[PDB]
Amino acid sequence: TAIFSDRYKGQRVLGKGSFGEVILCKDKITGQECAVKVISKRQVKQKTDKESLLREVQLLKQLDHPNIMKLYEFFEDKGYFYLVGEVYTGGELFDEIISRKRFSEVDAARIIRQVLSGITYMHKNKIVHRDLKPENLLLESKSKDANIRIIDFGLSTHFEASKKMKDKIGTAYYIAPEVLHGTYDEKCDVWSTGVILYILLSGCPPFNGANEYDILKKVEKGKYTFELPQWKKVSESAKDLIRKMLTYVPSMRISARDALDHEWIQTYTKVPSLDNAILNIRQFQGTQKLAQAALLYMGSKLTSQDETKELTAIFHKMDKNGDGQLDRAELIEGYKELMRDASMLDASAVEHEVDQVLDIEYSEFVTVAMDRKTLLSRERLERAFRMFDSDNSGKISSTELATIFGVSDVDSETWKSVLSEVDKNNDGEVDFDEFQQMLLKLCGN
Template identity: 40%
Template sequence: MGSKCCRDDNIQKKDEMETAQNPDVSIPPGPEQKASLSQQESKKSQVEEQQAKIESKQIEYAMESEIHQEQEQKPAAASLIQEQQSKVSEIVQSQKMTNEQIKNEVQSKSQTGNCAGSMAKKIKLGVDIFVKLKEGSIGSHYNFGKVLGQGAFGKVWKVTHKTTGLIRAIKQIKKSSIIKEEESRLFSEMNILKNLDHPHIVKLFELFQDENNYYLVTEYLSGGELFDRIKKMSSFSESIAADYIRQILLATVHCHEQKIVHRDLKPENIIFINEDPQSQLKVIDFGTSRKFDNQKVMSKRLGTPYYIAPEVLGHSYNEKCDIWSCGVILYILLCGYPPFVGKTENQILERVKMGKFSFDPEDWDSISKEAKEFITKLLRMDPNKRLSAKQALEDPWLVKYAPSTQVNRKVLDNIRQFQAQTVLKQALMSYMITQMSTQKEIQELQKEFQRLDINNDGFLSKEEFLKGYIQIQNDLKLAEEEVEKILEMIDINRSGQIDFSEFCMAAMNQEKLLSVQRVEQAFKIFDQNGDGFISKKELEAVMGDLGDDVWNQILSDCDNNGDGQISYEEFVKMLKNKKL
């Protein structure tokens, strides 16, 4: 625990110069000042005072760290400029690739003469198909409400979707206010968030840009920050702390499984969905996240001093920097103050580099030995000896407070009855579940998803589904046949496993998902000119460039009168009929 982080003196001096700019900032009291949970609100205000000044330096950290890039990772100047200039096109290109795959598969199936139902099962329709950068006035889609936050780059608004009435949040970013470094991070966040599909990660709905601004449309989380919730609680227990850190770790595992590192996990970036005492948590702000390569270390110094891992300060780290942050968060949850404190930012970082912390008896005697051992495993100086996110979820302390694994039979029955045999029906049901469902509807299903997700990676494999179905189907052979049919039907992005949104699409009661109100709203969203018909151009405005092959296949599935467009009656019949 006492080993020092390896760094050269020049880098250390540079860090000291940076952090010494703010020598008089007050910080949370350390254990020697005996911080109890009842004092937590005052501690929080002190943390916030220091935090506000620290966060103003985040861009400096990013800019400064470029100097210390590892040699094998340092791009040439021309390459860096080219990379920055290509960020906007990456989103568009990823959209084109998705739809190019659709077109190729449709053409291939058309040539072999397979039936429409079989064809629909083979086309890939990921949830990211609906999240593409759109041009035009965002005000034609949303009514703007109150401002939720404001910074140097723009504002965050509470908004209402005009067609569905759903409440969302819009992050407005002024183009004139962001430098190339920040623009690069913005588009990185867009690309990462559009592909993350997990119960404990904030959902990105839409992207817009006009002449002056970029807009990120995300779900609206009204429950407040993690710290704010704890302040309001009259009592606090290890079981609640375990529940909260489990949810954070579940999101972290899902990211790490997809080679994504967050790099700024902290209580301010962990938000409750709503104000319900049983509300779930979501991780937000992926502006500092990135894809990582197991064969290469990362070197950019990003993060927030209280929660930053020592190896990040040494400019050589991997995804386990997120685990260190989780350890700091859990430490604070259980005692009310951080493990590494100081009177200045520089002192905080020096103590992080040392990695020494203690469990003051007055504050920790009532905390279990298992909890303290778990924190120690998360805060090991050597990342190779530190737990991985998956290992952390299997720790005895967390297992002790693990939720029930008994699967709801009704949910499994809904999945067995799910049918969506045409290209358009698959796409529309995916759109309804990802873009039009309420948080309450989804929250009712996420516990069932996590009961089935035995390895906690945020996906359901064939084996995991089979274990769930054996609970209601004792015959192994019949259960295997059932699971094969289910996977073929609901794995609409053809990944070989079931994503969270795919699960929700099939697990939700179909009458509820395809209610009259929701079907009408969906038609209005696609029928953008309001003439009572959906044209190829209008469908593409939501789903991207489909091409003639896919459009012709859609028409053959549901254009009963052959007029080359989809009427409301045809739309309803296609969605409501179980067999098409």
């Protein structure tokens, strides 16, 4: 057996994908950078045995396609799995798209030919994604004509998805109806890609609703339209491909490979800009990211409540003196003890964090060590609020809050009630401090 931190050290956290946090790490000998997804066993159940996971891992390491994340290594210890893959710098596809003056079917066809090409390859090797969505499409580099790299292929088969809403935002729109009901195969990826295509050419989800369950209700019924005025600008062959990919019965649904041969992919890769679709995607994306940011802020405030009190009790018990003061090594031992932590991969990781907080009285260390994380979490929320507020009015209206909280799965009576307690007179709009106050009251503060 071989240990992960013998070989890799953490550089810095990258984000929270499905199943766990992704950490930028560096090989301590060759200096190679890698994106390590760390799966916490204690919060992510397995669907399969160890025998079956080690086999898929062995296979995934051998596979190689320019539109699929390269997986280098797999580690496991008592408490976690470590998936070590190549790191990409171009960001999520949709964030790159919203920063464009123009976007035509030629851009959409090129994007989707890549996605279908990755999928086709994977299905040939009997690997299904199931959870394909825009968050899982990364651009390989910051440069112009760069490859899309699909992440997380094969994982849904071996791990149970979170049922917490901070992990579910923007999954409902893309899931294939047959996955909802239990009997599904590789055709579910074609469906998901079909929904992405739809959104690329109109900027609106084909199945949409006020909340998660309403979205799933629309998907399960399977009915959508091309009524929206901006479809008047999309070719018929594009609509024709969408129809085949969003075909309800999976055996009647076009395959990945066959979609690559479809007339639309054939024509539009080998031309007006969809101006309306871009403005729609830009609004969609801000909305999703602000809802995500809200939920993560609420979560971090609750973790902070938890971890503040726990560290205090640890440092109290450790202070044999009653001095209200601890040594450096003891602050490290009690901080290590707090971990019983994506960044804190080893004892050396923690020492840096302890030394950052210092750069005496344990009660002060506790405030700062958390207050850092508390202020750190606020700023991500602020940025998303600014981004959402695209006309720089400084406010979010009632209608917008309803869209935002609906995506966040906060009951309408519950947030409206919270709004009233924050500002009485109110005037139907909230500024940033009001928004933040509402979220504090939505996590018992």
